[PDB]
Structure formats: structure tokens, C-alpha cells
Amino acid sequence: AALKDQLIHNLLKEEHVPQNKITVVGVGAVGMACAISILMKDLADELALVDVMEDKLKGEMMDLQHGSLFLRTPKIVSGKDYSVTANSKLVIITAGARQQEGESRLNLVQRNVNIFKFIIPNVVKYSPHCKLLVVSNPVDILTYVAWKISGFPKNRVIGSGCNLDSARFRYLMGERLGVHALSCHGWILGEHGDSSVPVWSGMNVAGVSLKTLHPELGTDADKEQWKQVHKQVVDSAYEVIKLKGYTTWAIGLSVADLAESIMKNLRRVHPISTMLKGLYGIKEDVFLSVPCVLGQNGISDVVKVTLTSEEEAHLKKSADTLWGIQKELQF
Amino acid sequence: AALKDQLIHNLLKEEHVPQNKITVVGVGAVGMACAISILMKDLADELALVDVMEDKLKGEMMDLQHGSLFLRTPKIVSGKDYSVTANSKLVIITAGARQQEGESRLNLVQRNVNIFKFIIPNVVKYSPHCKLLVVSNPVDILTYVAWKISGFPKNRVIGSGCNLDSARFRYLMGERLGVHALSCHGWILGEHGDSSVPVWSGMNVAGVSLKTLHPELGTDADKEQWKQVHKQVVDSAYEVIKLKGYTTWAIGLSVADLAESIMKNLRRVHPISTMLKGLYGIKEDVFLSVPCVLGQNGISDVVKVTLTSEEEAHLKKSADTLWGIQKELQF
Amino acid sequence: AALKDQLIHNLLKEEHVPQNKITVVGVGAVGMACAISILMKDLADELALVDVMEDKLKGEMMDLQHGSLFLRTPKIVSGKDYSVTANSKLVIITAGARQQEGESRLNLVQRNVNIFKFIIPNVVKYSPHCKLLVVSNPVDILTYVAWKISGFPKNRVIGSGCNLDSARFRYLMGERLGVHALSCHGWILGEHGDSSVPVWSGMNVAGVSLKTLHPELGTDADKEQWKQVHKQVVDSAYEVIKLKGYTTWAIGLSVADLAESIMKNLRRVHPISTMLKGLYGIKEDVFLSVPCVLGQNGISDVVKVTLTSEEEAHLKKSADTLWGIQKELQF
Amino acid sequence: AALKDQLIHNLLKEEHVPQNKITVVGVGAVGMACAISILMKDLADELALVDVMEDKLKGEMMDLQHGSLFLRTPKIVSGKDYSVTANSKLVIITAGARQQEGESRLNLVQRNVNIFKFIIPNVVKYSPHCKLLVVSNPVDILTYVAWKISGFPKNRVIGSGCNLDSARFRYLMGERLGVHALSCHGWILGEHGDSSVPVWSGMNVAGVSLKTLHPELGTDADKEQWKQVHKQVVDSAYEVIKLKGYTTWAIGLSVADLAESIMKNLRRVHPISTMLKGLYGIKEDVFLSVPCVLGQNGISDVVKVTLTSEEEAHLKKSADTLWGIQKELQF
Numbered sequence A, B, C, D: 001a002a003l004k005d006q007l008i009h010n011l012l013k014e015e016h017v018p019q020n021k022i023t024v025v026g027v028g029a030v031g032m033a034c035a036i037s038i039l040m041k042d043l044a045d046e047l048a049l050v051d052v053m054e055d056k057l058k059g060e061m062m063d064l065q066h067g068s069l070f071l072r073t074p075k076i077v078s079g080k081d082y083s084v085t086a087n088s089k090l091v092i093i094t095a096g097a098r099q100q101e102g103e104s105r106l107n108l109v110q111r112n113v114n115i116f117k118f119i120i121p122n123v124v125k126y127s128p129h130c131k132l133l134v135v136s137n138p139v140d141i142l143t144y145v146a147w148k149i150s151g152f153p154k155n156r157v158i159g160s161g162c163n164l165d166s167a168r169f170r171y172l173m174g175e176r177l178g179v180h181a182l183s184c185h186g187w188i189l190g191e192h193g194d195s196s197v198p199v200w201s202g203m204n205v206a207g208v209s210l211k212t213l214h215p216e217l218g219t220d221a222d223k224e225q226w227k228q229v230h231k232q233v234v235d236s237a238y239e240v241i242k243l244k245g246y247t248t249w250a251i252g253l254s255v256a257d258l259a260e261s262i263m264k265n266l267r268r269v270h271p272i273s274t275m276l277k278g279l280y281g282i283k284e285d286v287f288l289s290v291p292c293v294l295g296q297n298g299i300s301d302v303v304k305v306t307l308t309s310e311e312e313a314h315l316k317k318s319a320d321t322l323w324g325i326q327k328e329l330q331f
């Protein structure tokens, strides 16, 4: 017969069900950065890519497949049709609406809701037990949208939130102190972007609190302008976009880190976006970044960080704003 | 009174001299794919990026730096000035001229020569003991150019050649046979691109020669059209460019694989482009892909593959053509 | 309340089931080598250790747990009771009886049967869907025993067979040729130990068959004594025992390699022990090493290697001997 | 002539000089655990093993070599003669004298000095630029001995100190809180063993100080007995020795972690043993564990942890005792 039949003797015709499947939605720069980072960390036995642009999609898939020899992820698949995403343990959403000049913020968000209205039900249909990881911006709001539309319990809908911002923060701390980011500890919480909260009290190296050694840390009396470091974190995003057009690599790595905690059930603590109703006097259905314990069931626990009245107020303000927008959305 | 001084007691203001530095020249899609793949394989303690576009360069560097928390490569640097590349063990060249519409092959190469005339001397100036790995196309010719201009001994100038083409080939074999690419063996040699030579005799799984089981393999009498698989490997590159605009990920992975053999002195055999004068009756200064042993000093040995008179002639033809062009170049 | 309650806010109550659990039976040197190799390759989210010696068991567990900071396997457990092995995807058996002076082959095997009669039913009880990987010697026979007692279908009972022997063989060929073992290809098949079959025809580097370049390869006319290399592979085990008392590291690495193919569904080809009834004119229920495709469902396919009449006869001889013993066993 | 010559065409006869060589001294359980951990983390391109027991040494080497296919460290060597250790970047010392019953502390140390008087000069002779990492106990004293005998500057002589003790501590914290050890932070400082200092003030999760939430933490008024966790860390070593006879795995992993920081120049902070004269009012030449920044030149910086008068006194006491012994030693 065929060569295959002359060479290989088959013992078992069984249809495969993947054990550790991950799906990435959106094959723009961010999606592809997430994909490659995941592939290089051996987190999945099957990777699925979905987008609306069929050509780009197929091309990215082929490019990855050609590298199979150098990978340990035996199956990479793609398609416009969400059936290819079946049985994902984790689905990462990077797709969004592309911005129009002169469009209001509310309008942009609504257009994303309309996109998610197509995406989410299709995801849930084929992977009813998956965890959702939302990366698209604005992340805290779109994580809420995905939660609402999916009908999943809140532990299973996760926003990337301030994971990357905290990583940037630690990198910058490390630059100033001459130590690796891994050994600098610091937390950025709340709303992703301009209104994030740097928790000065918690900043340390080897368990030595910086605020104790330098009490003006994070104030304006601060002659070393540490307050600037936080501003720098917020600005660096735009700085990079101004320079190369967009951001990709850092987000990809940050997302893969989250995926690792989930796929391996590590129960590490990450500053990620979860529903916060009932904490710090927040009474609305909003998602904000707090330190969360992350594992195979998504977010199981939250760490209660002790905040100053100023910081606590800053969070409530963010919650009010987010709710203000969310209440205006048409589902 | 400064915080750093209150926290850290310094023992040494030592000079950074990096031990395992890698430089990537060119921060287009291919360059950046090489960079990220290298970063994720912990091959270097310092990575340098060089290009002519300062904005793009700086942006890519920052994006990578922001991910330092998730990496184990403590120093990432960039610049227009080649001084930032000093003391590289390995320098990867991805820069080049893009071909223009209806442009003659000789003309295209000459334009690249002019670019390399600036790049190579600067590289050699700051890293006189490095190995050069050329990725730019056309790779066999440009590897020759780099060799000529660098004045390095031939063991230290390496072209990526048919490394990726062979990897694509094995992937496709694996698809047809239902086994991983890792367990399919096959070699594509000679000139990179449409005139590559698939060595049918050497194709095997578990040491079982396919040509023995299916004697018409690779001919036109072949009713399974295995000859098509080779055509497919050649077409793949264009197929992907047509679909997504360019090729990146697979090259990045293939290059990182080569970097691994070099940085860790593995002495694995790869189908890569080396100077072949003196083999298969080739008497000209030409580079073509043959199976090479790759280690810390570059290419130390070559494996003498037994070729049919047809295959051998095909190689000589390629050598003649390449020399025909090379002899016309203005250095 | 407690500190834990003041610090952590719980969102989700539930007792969890591990997704990628591996169990190792036997915590002698071989078992522990398998364990450490598996832990360092991030193959499992939970690792279970079982043995009869409760002290040694608990001590090994604790020692490993203390290293959890440096690992990515969050749960390590142990116990005399097999309930701790529940929900394993893969169970690796290293326990067994050591042969006595003057003791017949049949007697040795029977003593192991008696041990397996306790182990296997307990394993299958708590992990009815697992794959069994038998490492204990004599491996081909004990793999049969485990199959018989488990009542599992044959694709799911795997013997480590000649995986390590082939790896040793490639290492030795690499030493002689000056290339890495990864680039030397060679297969040792059949019965593990002194009756193994080195398949000379299939030995190659870069697809160049050594038998073609050196037709006396593997004969006694062979002035380079390649036949000795195979003898060396057989003797290696004893050589190492004579020197350091026992063997561990290489087996551990070889087993982890198999585990990787299974846990990641790679469908790589390994020379491992599977039931061969129906191949090479073998009509009995025996296990021998042949090249097998290994994936998430165990052994799905076998590669039909073309053997010389001598080689084929050698296999049949081994099958006859094994059956001779197996038919006498008391279950 | 030979098959090798018919198959491989040599282009380069060069001398091998390893780029990232590591030597382990002592092939007892601890040494071998360090070796395997290092091999599995791809930290070296050459690994050397040295001990006085030639048989055990050779056997361990061979066992490792047989696994070469599954490793990416191409050269593993061993010998009684220290010439095999030439050009090591890092030398790890695990050899030492085993205690005799009723032998005084001073006597035991002196016997180790006599051993180190043979080892260290030989190490320094062949690898004059290496860093020394001392693991043997008592580590703080023997690190001093090695420093004295080597004549190296102090940044290059490192004791493993409380690295593992801190790792155990974090594991136990994690067990109590239901979070991974990676996300629990805590430091054990000073003299390795019974007199270590747990720094309660610095203990945190996500930057939330436990001492702030539970002010009696670490006292006897502490109804949760956190003080016990420290006792547990000290006892666990003996507990494991009672159970298995010795400790191996955790030390091996801890050491490999340090090796990673050194070989990759990460500048992470570890609690390791360095010379402390001039800090906390210590005026003698003694080594104790404090948080050190670790990189390619060894210890570049030390973090000044803020200590209570009790803690500070505890350290001075330890310094006095160590000096008491050190001043009696015959070099």
C-alpha cells in the first residue's frame, strides 16, 4: 500500500482529547507575543489561534508550525470558527476594537462590548469549563464585560490588570538600587493605567521596608522623587508606543507568567484584575487589580492589603468611574 | 542620606565584562524573533541590539527590558553605535536590503555588499574574536561577503543556510507519517531556496530508509508525490509572506537552535552554510549548506554525505552560479 | 481571628483534583533518580511517592518538599497506602526483588510476581485510567506481568526496555566520531540485556549509513571492532555497579524522557518494550523493545524495522525463552 | 583508513578551553545532588568532579555520561588529580570530615582545616580566577578557612549559609497560609544551624507585614506559635537524617540556585555567608549570613537589614563564639 502503511504498524485508532489546551484570541502583535511566550514555556499540548482575518491567521499558524522541531507543543491549530478552540483549559483574549479618531471613550468601549458579544458565547460554547484571561484594553472594564456575558463564576474570569505595571515598577526599582527585579518587591494596584495606586508601604528589598528608611518616600517632600518612578511606569507604555508603534514583548511575558500559575496550579500571588465588590467599601460590580492567589481554578483567594485612607479613597474613586461607564453599556 | 546608601553596602565598583554576550544586528521582524527566542533560552548574560532606526531600536529595547522580571538575562542594550556590541561571543546579522521590483540578482547583492561594508568592519572592530552568523538573504552569498570583508577564518563565519528548510521538511514528513518532526530525519543541502537538494537516500524514521521501502521516492514515477514535499518547503516562505506579510517565528527558533550549539559547545550536526572549496570537486570560494559540526569555535568539521552523480552535479551547478555573481561584486 | 484569616480573604471552597499527576513506586536510588528528573522537567503538578519503608519514604518526601521554592511542582506527597496515588496519569514502577546467588530465572520472576500482585491492583484501583511504565528488571517479563495483572489494554502498559541502552549506544558512537550523541543515530532492540539486537543497518550520522561506508561493521572481520561497542553497552550496567555500587542517574533521565513524550503527547519514537504478538512472526504474548510511537495514550503505533534473517531469528529466540518462563508463572 | 575519516572531514584542530566550567569537590550524596541539579539547569558547558575515592568517582562520572543524550552539557570529567578542574569559573566544595563521637568542636574543625589545606591550594592553582562556594559544615567557619587559605579577596569566597534554611522557612510559611513558597517572604540570618536569626519584622506576603497584623508574632505570647516554625526549620535537617540517613536534594537545589545567579550574573539577593567585619558592631574576621547581591564576581553588595537590639546581640554572640574557635586554628 502506501509508504506510511509499509513503515508504521498501527495498534490503536483513538481520537485525541487534549489535556492542556490553550487558546489565544487575536493574532495581532499582543496575541502573537502571548503565543510565542507560551510555546517557549511548554505550557500546552495544544495551542489554538482564532481571529477574523483568515489570511493573517493561517500565516501565523504556518510560521509557528514550521518551528515544531524546536518546540514541545505537538499541535498548533487555527480557524475563524470557534470549534477549533474546543476543550481549552485557558482562553486568552487579546482581540478588541481598533480606535477611531474623534470617537468618545464610551463609544469605543461599546464597540468592544459588541465584539465580545460575538466572541465570548462562542468560547463558552466549546470550552464551558475554561478560565478566561482578558488582556484587551481597557482591561478592567472588558474583564467585567466578559464576566457578564459568559455567566461564569467570578473566580474564572481574570483580567491581566496591573501584572505588567508591577513588573515595570520592579524593573525600575532594580535599576535605581542595582539589584535584579526579582529581588525588588513592590505592588501597583487598582485601575490599570494612569490611576494605578503604588503601595509605598509594601516596597522592600530583602524584607527591609524602604518607607521606614526614607519616610518621605512617595510624597512630594521626597527629595529622591520616588513618586516619579510610578509616573514613569505609566508613561513608559506611551513612550514605547511613540517609539515603535505598540507594545508586545513585555505583555506576552507577563501573560505567560499568569498562564504558568494557572496551568501548574502554583497558587502564586499576582496583582491582577478581579471582581472586588465587598472589599475596601466598594459596593459596585467592578474589577480592579489586587493581589490574588492564582491556580488551576483561577482566583481562589485575595490578599487584604492594608491601605492608607488616601489610597483607599483613590480606589473608590476608580470604582465610581468604572461603574459610571459600565452602567451605560448595552448588552 | 540617600536611600541606596542606607540600604546597600557596596563591596566593588567592578566593570561589567560580559561572559556570554550575543549581539543581534537588525531589529526587523526576523531580528526581534531571534532576540526573543534567545532571551527565552537563557543563552546570553547580555544581549545587544543594533540598527539604523534609532526610534524602533530604543522602543524594542525598552519593551524587552520591561519583561526582565520574567527573564534570566540581566542586561539588554542597544544603540546605533557599534561600541555597544563590544565583546560579543556571537553576532547575528539579520540586516540587509529588501529586493526591489524587477531588480537583478547581482544588483540586489551589490546593494547588500554596500551595507555590509559598513556593518562588518564595525562588528569586527569591537568583537574581534566573535563568530558571525549570517541570516540575511541571499544567505549563501552574503555569508561569503561577510567572510571576505571580515577577514575571519572560515570556521567562524556561518550562514543559517538550509537549517530551517530541513526543519520544515521534517515537519511535513511528520504530518504525513503521524510522528513528531523530532523523530523524522531528512536533509536539505546546497543552495538555500528553490535550488536546494533534498537527499532522498538519507530520509528515515528509526533508521528505516524510506527510499528502500518505496524505491520511486523523489522521482516523478512516485505516485505519492514526495517530490512535492520539497517543492512545498521552497514555497512555504512565499506562502507565509503572501498571507501575513513576512516570516519570523520559525527563523527565530532555528537561529536560537544554532546559537545553543555554539554557546554550549554541543558539537551537534546542522545543515548550515559553510565554505566548501575542496569538497565534491568544487574549486571556487563558495558557501553552501552541508551537515556541519557546530561548537564554540564555529564549524570544526563537515560530514561527507554520499551523493548521487545527479545530486553532485546539482551542487556544482549552484557553485558555478554563485561564483558567477560573486566574481562581479565591487568590494 | 487567625493570622491567615486577617491576611487572606477566601473566594472559593473546594477540594481539588490534580491534572498532571505522576506517581513513582519505589524510593530506592532508581526511584529517586526518576523523581528528581521529573521534578526538574516540570512534567507534573503533583508527584506521589510510594514504598513499604515508611521512614525512608517520609524522609525523601521532606527533603524534596524543602526544595519547593526552586521547583514548579506545588504538591509532593507520599505514603505506604496507595490512596495517595489517586488520579495519576502516569505510574512508574521501580520496585522489585534483587536476584539471589544460585537462583533460577523462573524463581526470581515469581518472587517479583508476588510483589506485583500487591502493587498493581492497588495502583489500578486508585488510578484506573493511568498508564503504567515498568522499569524494574527483568523489564520485558515484568511488563508482561503488570499487563496481565492490571487487565489494562496493551497500549497503556509500557516497559522502559532498551531506551537507555540505545542512549548509551549513541553516547559511545559519539565518543568515537567526535559528535554529540544527539546527532548519532542507532537502535538497540529486542530483549533488554545480554540478548539485545544492535541494528547495524540503521546506524547513521546526518543520514549517512555507516554500514555502507564500512561493510564489515558489526562483524568479526571488522578491524574497528564496532561489535565491541554493543558489548560495552551490555557491560555498562555491571561496570557501573562494580565501581559505585548501583546505577541511577542515566535511568532517571531516560525515564523522564519517556514521561515527557507521554505527558506532552509528542508522538516521538522510542525503543521501548511493548507487546509484539503479530509482528516478525511472533505468536506468543511477549513484550520486546521495538521503535514505538509514544503519546498521551501510551503506545499507539510501532515502526516496522526491516531486519536481517539473523536478527529476525534472534528476536524469535528471545520470544520463545520469555514465553517459556511466562507460561510457568503462578498468578 | 578509519570509518571516522571516511565519514567526517576535519577543518580545525583546536584546543578545547571551556567557557562556563563548574567543578564539584566531593561526590558524596550532597556533591552528587549539586551535580545533577546543575546539569539539569544547563549552567555549565563542562562539569568536573573531584574526590579521593577513585572508584566511586569514576562510577558516578560514567553514570552521568550515559545520560548525555538527555543533557546539554557536552563534557563531564573526573579525577583524583586537580588538573581536571582547570579553568573553572565556579568551584563548589562539599568535601569535609565526618564527626566523631566525643570529639570537641575545635578538633572537628581542625581536621577539616587539614583537609582544606590540601584541597584549596590545588583548586586555586588550576583556577586562579574562580569563585569558591563552600557548602561543607560548619559552613560559616569553613568559609573563613577557605578564604584564609586561598588568599582570595572576600567577594569571591562564599558560604551557602542560610540559603536553604530560608527556603525551608518559606515553604513552611506557605503551608500555613495556603500560598506558594515563592510568594511568601522571610529571612533567616546569621549563623547557620541552631543559632540562626529569624527576622520577624521582614516577613510578608504581597508586601503586607505579618508582624503588623499579628504583633505577638515570634514571641511566646504568640498563640499561633510562629516561633515554632523557626525551630522546625532547624530540626528538619536532623529529622531527615534520622529518616533517610542524610540530606541531599534540597541542598542540591539551593546550591544550583546560587550557581545560577553567579553564572548568569543576575544580581539577585540571597541569604548567604560573607565576611561581616564592620557591620552590626562586629569587629572580628567572621562569616555570617546576610542578604547579599550575587553575580559573576561573587558578592558585590550587602543589604543592611535593620535589626532589633535583641537580634543584633544574638549576632554578636555568634561572632564571638566563631572567633573563639577560629583564633585557635593552626594553618
Ligand SMILES: Nc1ncnc2c1ncn2[C@@H]1O[C@H](COP(=O)(O)O)[C@@H](O)[C@H]1O
Pocket (backbone or CB within 6 Å): B193, B194, B234, B235, B236, B237, B238, B239, B240, B241, B242, B243
Ligand atoms: N503575492 C505572493 N506572495 C507570496 N507568495 C506568492 C505570491 N504569489 C505567488 N506566490 C507563491 O510563492 C511560491 C514561489 O516560491 P518562493 O518565492 O520560493 O516562495 C509559488 O508557489 C507561488 O504560487
